[PDB]
Write a protein that binds this ligand. Structure first.
Ligand SMILES: *[C@@H]1O[C@H](CO)[C@@H](O[C@@H]2O[C@H](CO)[C@@H](O)[C@H](O)[C@H]2NC(C)=O)[C@H](O[C@@H]2O[C@@H](C)[C@@H](O)[C@@H](O)[C@@H]2O)[C@H]1NC(C)=O
Ligand SMILES: *[C@@H]1O[C@H](CO)[C@@H](O[C@@H]2O[C@H](CO)[C@@H](O)[C@H](O)[C@H]2NC(C)=O)[C@H](O[C@@H]2O[C@@H](C)[C@@H](O)[C@@H](O)[C@@H]2O)[C@H]1NC(C)=O
Ligand SMILES: *[C@@H]1O[C@H](CO)[C@@H](O[C@@H]2O[C@H](CO)[C@@H](O)[C@H](O)[C@H]2NC(C)=O)[C@H](O)[C@H]1NC(C)=O
Ligand SMILES: *[C@@H]1O[C@H](CO)[C@@H](O)[C@H](O)[C@H]1NC(C)=O
Ligand SMILES: C[C@H]1O[C@H](O)[C@H](O)[C@@H](O)[C@H]1O
Length: 257
């Protein structure tokens, strides 16, 4: 079967066929999300992703190769097949390379690159082109809360009026301070017990997260998950740690009004 959606990525911008041209070889880029046909992507059971009747195509299968639109019947078969890993990557199976936005700006051209699980490599296939705004409820039914740039995140009693408990879940798989959307939940390293803080969004692997089906919030590069340190909310420390399924690693999003 087939179905059509937008594809939201870095900084909440959308995958867009540049200038709305359908000529073979036209690059894909980031552009602010809308309803224009050059942002509407049809996913077919043959693993093609189509816009304006043509296919998302790797113009080469090397690190740094450009991704373009191209006639689906004349492109190389290997170059038009894509899958959508549950962590939000868009992968070309033949090469193993993944769709990447190398800069945050509008008009950045999308490339196939080595998978480093970067936030620049995160995408969401959806008709809602706005970030989802939610509280993140965890251990002891408390809420995850921001506390400024460079500072730790930590747990507090949930309050409908606390803006610092309000998170924008962006299409690039970043978790952002809703009121200050240039700031990202960031692990301060990839090792167990590294602290989770807020830092300027930079596309990094340390800023990419995945909400899995076991109630964990996973950092794909490290493999490790958000953890209320020592099950002790008074420490005011959230770390990354291996997944245990314990109550201090369970989370659920609660959509905000
Ligand atoms: C695949 O392409 C990437 C983008 O060109 C390479 O990473 C980039 O390497 C640049 C130096 O050549 C570096 O200044 C860029 O910031 C970096 N981009 C990022 C953020 O990944 C990548 O090169 C590998 O990784 C980089 C960071 C260095 O460690 C290089 O020595 C590595 O070769 C390319 N991968 C390969 C396998 O060449
Ligand atoms: C993809 O490239 C194909 C090969 O060049 C195009 O099919 C060819 O379209 C020609 C111009 O319309 C037509 O004279 C040829 O007979 C046909 N060739 C073959 C081998 O089918 C194709 O065009 C689409 O498909 C054809 C069948 C017609 O329906 C066209 O009007 C379609 O545009 C190219 N696809 C696209 C979307 O451009
Ligand atoms: C989250 O932050 C967003 C962005 O600042 C807030 O959305 C703005 O809200 C005002 C008032 O309703 C609107 O007029 C703007 O159009 C909104 N902007 C955007 C870009 O969406 C939002 O209210 C915040 N809180 C929640 C719960 O979503
Ligand atoms: C939790 O952390 C606080 C703050 O550091 C500390 O005073 C308290 O003793 C800890 N509780 C436990 C059970 O370790
Ligand atoms: C480069 C761009 O120019 C304008 C269009 O509305 C976009 O969808 C985009 O393609």
């Amino acid at each position: 079967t087939s179905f059509t959606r937008n594809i939201v990525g870095r900084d909440g911008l959308c995958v867009d066929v540049r200038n709305g041209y359908d000529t073979d070889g036209t690059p894909l880029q980031l552009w602010p999300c809308g309803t224009q046909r050059n942002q509407r992507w049809t996913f077919d059971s043959d693993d093609t992703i189509r816009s304006m009747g043509k296919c998302m195509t790797a113009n080469g299968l090397n690190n740094g190769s450009n991704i373009v639109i191209f006639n689906c019947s004349t492109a190389a078969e290997n170059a038009i097949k894509w899958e959508v890993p549950i962590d939000g990557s868009i992968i070309n199976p033949s090469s193993g390379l993944v769709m990447t936005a190398p800069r945050a700006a509008s008009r950045t051209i999308l490339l196939l690159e080595d998978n480093i699980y970067a936030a620049s490599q995160g995408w969401t296939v959806t008709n809602n082109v706005k970030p989802i705004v939610a509280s993140i409820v965890g251990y002891k039914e408390m809420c995850l809360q921001s506390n400024g740039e460079n500072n730790g995140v930590w747990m507090e009693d949930c309050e409908a009026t606390s803006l610092q408990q309000q998170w924008a879940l962006y299409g690039d798989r970043t978790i952002r301070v809703n009121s200050t959307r240039g700031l990202c939940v960031t692990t301060n390293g990839y090792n167990s017990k590294d602290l989770i803080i807020i830092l300027k969004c930079q596309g990094l692997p340390s800023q990419r997260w995945f909400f899995n089906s076991d109630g964990a919030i996973v950092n794909p590069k490290s493999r490790l998950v958000m953890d209320v340190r020592a099950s002790n909310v008074s420490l005011r420390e959230i770390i990354i740690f291996p997944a245990t399924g314990n109550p201090n690693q369970q989370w659920v999003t609660q959509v905000l009004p």
